[PDB]
Subunit: 151 residues, 6 copies
Amino acid sequence: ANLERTFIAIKPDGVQRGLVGEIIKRFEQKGFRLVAMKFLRASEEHLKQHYIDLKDRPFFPGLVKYMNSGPVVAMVWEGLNVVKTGAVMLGETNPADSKPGTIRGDFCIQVGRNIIHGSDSVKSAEKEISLWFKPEELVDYKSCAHDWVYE
Amino acid sequence: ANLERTFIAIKPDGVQRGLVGEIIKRFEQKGFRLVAMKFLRASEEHLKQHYIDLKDRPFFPGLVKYMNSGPVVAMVWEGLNVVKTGAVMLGETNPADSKPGTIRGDFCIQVGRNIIHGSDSVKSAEKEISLWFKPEELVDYKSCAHDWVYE
Amino acid sequence: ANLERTFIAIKPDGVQRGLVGEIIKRFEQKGFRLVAMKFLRASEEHLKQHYIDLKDRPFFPGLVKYMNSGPVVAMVWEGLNVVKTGAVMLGETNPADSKPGTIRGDFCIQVGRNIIHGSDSVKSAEKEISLWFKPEELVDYKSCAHDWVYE
Amino acid sequence: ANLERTFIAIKPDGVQRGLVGEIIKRFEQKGFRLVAMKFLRASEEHLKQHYIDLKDRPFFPGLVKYMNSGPVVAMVWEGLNVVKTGAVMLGETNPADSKPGTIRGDFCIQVGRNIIHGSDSVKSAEKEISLWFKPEELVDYKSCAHDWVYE
Amino acid sequence: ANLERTFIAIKPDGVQRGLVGEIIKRFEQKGFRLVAMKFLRASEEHLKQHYIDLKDRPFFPGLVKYMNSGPVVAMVWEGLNVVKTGAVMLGETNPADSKPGTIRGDFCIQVGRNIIHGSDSVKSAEKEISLWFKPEELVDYKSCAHDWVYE
Amino acid sequence: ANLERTFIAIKPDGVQRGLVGEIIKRFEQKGFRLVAMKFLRASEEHLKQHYIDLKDRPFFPGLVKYMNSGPVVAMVWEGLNVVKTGAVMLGETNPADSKPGTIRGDFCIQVGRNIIHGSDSVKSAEKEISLWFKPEELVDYKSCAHDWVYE
């Protein structure tokens, strides 16, 4: 009954390279419902919170600097298995392993410029939704094609 | 030689979700030849015959009712290995497993609303072609690009 | 006036050149409803009835020859002002006078190879629909997006 | 000149019909800079402020109704003559007068379901921007391709 | 008449902004025949020859500097009225005046960064083809779809 | 490393079937840099050198015949791991094994009409580049988006 949500952020390279519309189209055409969306330059402290699990990695400062180097598009999407399916659609974390047809497979080359983030679990998703969105920014509506996407 | 043919049907949800053009385009761009095509609401009797091998399964009444709940686009496509290759282009029957780049992978979420049918064997293909089309609704012509698609 | 219908045929060149999906997509995305569709080689006799107002013109033989030279995709589309708007979408009769973004403007060059026909008036649409389709081939269903296309 | 901004809102019909990505791609590909974006159900109050110059009009309570009937994507885009040019890109107010190639020409049919709003003048834009966005929601960054879009 | 040629050049901003595939696709989809294509950084001397008519204009040095500032894609396309029709497809010289659906209307903003050049007459085309291409770089072949593009 | 180059040739079938723009777009959008491009009918003598290793095979004559039967688009592309990644983008040598989302998977059917060639190694690539291009045909410039594709 198809209420799972995931957090997806188009990274500053995705914005800079003019991919926002293309990426959103992929999620819309698949049948997922856009729940929330905002555009911002994320603060350093916010990004450190987001990537708290990577804080002791040598690449972490560079990741935070890159993730703050331009605006991101932050989104929440709803649908059956949106967490795992969203991850499939994005492609492997490293664009190198990413297959053609996927977002990273189609559009990027290096892991440190891999255009998009998607939650890696339901638990991570709910943390990330809380971090990036106030509850009232999550919009409840019913898609007109819902009964053709779901039995 | 006379090339292999497959039966492709765009299901009520694929029509409803506005994917008819997108789907046909993928077959045309691959180099397959459209042999036949019609748009209809398949009667429950016609669907009972299409799914006759499933007449004793518990889901059969619901399947037939669903498949009768909107029009389908019924098609025959020709080409080398079109049955197997068409099936790959459609993706796995469960969209949860279908890869980005495939029809079901790109455009749908749940197996009960999986937008499209393709024949699963040459046997099944000929069965399906004979059921859904009169032999005179199958058009013979040579694609202008045939000698660039086939040696 | 939202039940108006037009007759659209993809001409033999439009089929040969692989434009069936593209064409259908433009009608779907606009919000029009597909009512009927089939794929056939129209007989010379059928085409003489379609072009009956022109039977005494010198270009008649060549017109019927062209329209019979391969299969066409015959369609009925429904919506508010679909006749006039559909015509605008197609472009002008001469592709050279058809603007970029129209079907003829984007996809063909010469008036005698102008890929697509659309009815020129409601009167001609009603005539053409009857000629090419039996009433039982016209499917009645409601678009899930209807209430977002129409007030 | 180059720092002009306009207010673009994708109406509830454009969201419902899966056109958000499509619309953003058009502005991206043109060379305009996205300054702000958010997704929200606009309150009846907010909408009455936005349409305050029609309070005393027949069509007001149902307009405010439609515009509150689903979420909208509110955006601020920057560029030379973006107000006038954005308007041309959207098409005419009535989709029936909107040329193929424009957003309304391509995607919708009826004036009460015309998918998108754009500012009608520079003064209107600065009014709309200040109504719909906090100043801190407007992001200042430089497009990597700026020097290839502008002398 | 179907053997007319035109010179089309993607300017350095069109290459930088990743529009080469898109542009070529528009010409291919129209039915025109690619006759010659090369990628180069045009020399200052070459450019001064190309713009010989404007050699006494104040802006000529800056124009040559721009046009030398990155590579261009130089092309020759063949077809009926391709000089005039190519021009239409590109849009007006000033992207402010170019309509949605045209190359310039869809993809650029400022006249100085107007992404593409096409010949303005048969005489200009022949001059430009002689300047930019060696005779042996124009390739003779017949499109497989020629009889479907031309009567 | 980031300055690796590969050789990509769009075979005569790829040109004939109007896939030049589509192919180039896939490389552009990935973030690879176009270094060199020309369009020619490769002579039997040139193709004999290109396939020199296969000169004693029974299929060699028909291979050369095919590859000389129309023009090709020869390209050099640059970027990190572009040889291997380019290969993945193209799909397997046999279109039957090529996944949807790949060039051969999406656009062709038979191994002997498989639309495109890419280098199979760095060694091969440099050999092919020397054969197909003069060194002065390889253009040095920096992509405006370089710093958003690469760390």
